[PDB]
Amino acid sequence: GMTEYKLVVVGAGGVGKSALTIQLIQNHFVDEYDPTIEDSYRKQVVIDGETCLLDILDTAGQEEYSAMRDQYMRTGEGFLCVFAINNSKSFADINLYREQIKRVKDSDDVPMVLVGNKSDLPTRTVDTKQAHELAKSYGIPFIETSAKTRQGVEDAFYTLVREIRQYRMK
Amino acid sequence: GMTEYKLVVVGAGGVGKSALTIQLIQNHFVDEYDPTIEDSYRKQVVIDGETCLLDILDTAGQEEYSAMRDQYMRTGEGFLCVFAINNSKSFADINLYREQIKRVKDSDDVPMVLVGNKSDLPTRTVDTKQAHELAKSYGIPFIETSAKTRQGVEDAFYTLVREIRQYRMKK
Ligand SMILES: Nc1nc2c(ncn2[C@@H]2O[C@H](COP(=O)(O)OP(=O)(O)O)[C@@H](O)[C@H]2O)c(=O)[nH]1
Ligand SMILES: Nc1nc2c(ncn2[C@@H]2O[C@H](COP(=O)(O)OP(=O)(O)O)[C@@H](O)[C@H]2O)c(=O)[nH]1
Ligand SMILES: [Mg+2]
Ligand SMILES: [Mg+2]
Ligand SMILES: [Mg+2]
């Protein structure tokens, strides 16, 4: 068969979790997408010559209980912590999502990537230096993305897979 | 005699560790204070009817080794983990400081309080809900402070003393 990589996309509402996931899977930018819908996506891809399966959960952060969500949070191999560069509250939210991940995984060290989405916008409230500093303090990579222009979308998910690969080394 | 509560004030540079400590000890707000200076302060206070002595170290987070810092870190009874409400990087820094305290104390459970300083400022990057959520996940109290207005200053140090008191109660 093929190696599976279970990825979970987390972050504040409206950062672009769905738009980044739909861009990667379906090669389309959603101008509007139901903020309450939480779906899983499977995509066969080639990363550094490895034919592999991506099993991605696009979380919605809803109160409603979900057996599938519980599974992905506990068995998730890598997490994409997404914030919007024009939403300071979402950047501050990252540390909560990291604490939530640490809780659901029962681990201080989880493969994860910091994603600074909406890089296409000319007005920023979170600069690249602030974002790099946060990622450096966690010891994780930082990828600037735009679901609209496709900039860094593939890079964000592939770098996360590369982070999981690093943990699988011994 | 007077019981001695050894407190250590930690957090990112520029959050207001020195300004909170100088406000509590000297009743003055510093607009600027040497970021490299690390000093200890002793103050006699009455907390819930207990006349006691506060032995506070205002850390500077310098790489330079300090014998005094090492002793306050290892023997410190309670820690004030300070962030600035207009500095998101400092809020994210809290987990590193909490991990540093855990390492030097060689304990998963250390009395500590989360301090959200600069409450006087009208522009925030870290809201009260986010701060309460972080403190809830650690299981420690959260106190909003302002070294400028004196709001929550006494409350932050007194709550920390109350946290040490809780740990000193028979299991
Ligand atoms: N300009 C811009 N808008 C984006 C980008 N990503 C998402 N959006 C928009 O932001 C809104 C929220 O996106 P959505 O994917 O639903 O966010 P979610 O709640 O995190 O899943 C939508 O109107 C998207 O079209 C981006 O990179 N640039
Ligand atoms: N507005 C405001 N400024 C503060 C407050 N506390 C500290 N500052 C300012 O923040 C800067 C850094 O404070 P300082 O105590 O030196 O930070 P430290 O490096 O953590 O010790 C100085 O300009 C202080 O006057 C506060 O409560 N409100
Ligand atoms: Mg969504
Ligand atoms: Mg899209
Ligand atoms: Mg200082």
Question: DSSP letter string over A28-93?
Answer: ---SS--TT--EEEEEEEEETTEEEEEEEEE----SS--HHHHHHHHH-SEEEEEEETT-HHHHHH
Which token pair is B12? 């990112």
Work out how many domains chain B is built from and give that number.
1
B136 vs B142: CA distance, rounded Å: 8
Range of the domain at B95: 3-168
**Which residues fall within 8 angstroms of residue B134, CB to CB, at 6 or more apart?**
A95, A96, A99, B91, B94, B114, B142
Question: DSSP letter string over B49-97?
Answer: TEEEEEEEEE----SS--HHHHHHHHH-SEEEEEEETT-HHHHHHHHHH
- Are A33 and A18 in contact by the 8 Å Cβ rule? The answer is yes
B72 vs B21: CA distance, rounded Å: 15
A12 vs B3: CA distance, rounded Å: 46
Residues 137-156 of A with CB under 8 A from B: 137-138
Report resolution in angstroms.
1.5
**How many angstroms separate the most distant Cα atoms in chain A?**
46
- Sheet containing B78-84: order of strands: B39-47, B50-58, B3-10, B78-84, B112-117, B142-144
Q: List the CATH number of the domain containing B23.
A: 3.40.50.300
Q: For residue A136, how many other CB atoms are within 10 A of its CB? A: 12
B108 vs B123: CA distance, rounded Å: 35
- Are B69 and B56 in contact by the 8 Å Cβ rule? The answer is no
Q: Could you tell me if the CB of A126 is within 6 A of ligand 1?
A: no
Experimental method: X-ray
Q: Could you tell me if the CB of A35 is within 6 A of ligand 1?
A: yes
Minimal-distance CA residue of chain B relative to A126: B88
How far, in whole angstroms, is CA A50 from its chain's centroid?
21
Q: Which amino acid is at A139?
A: G
Query: DSSP assignment, residue A149?
Result: T
A41 vs B7: CA distance, rounded Å: 50
Q: Which residue, among A114, A128, A60, A45, has the nearest Cα to A83 in the 3D structure?
A: A114
Which token pair is A124? 């920023």
User: Which of A21, A24, A26, A32 to probe ligand 1 with, by most ligand atoms within 8 A of CB?
Assistant: A32
Instruction: Please tell me if residue A99 touches chain B, with a CB cutoff of 8 Å.
Output: yes
How far, in whole angstroms, is CA B65 from its chain's centroid?
21
**Which residues fall within 8 angstroms of residue A156, CB to CB, at 6 or more apart?**
A20, A80, A113, A115, A143, A145
A30 CA to centre of ligand 4 in angstroms: 4
User: Which of A37, A58, A81, A117 to probe ligand 1 with, by most ligand atoms within 8 A of CB?
Assistant: A117
Torsion of CA B150, B155, B160, B166, to 10 degrees: 170
Residue A104: HSE in the Cβ half-sphere, 13 Å Cα cutoff: 20
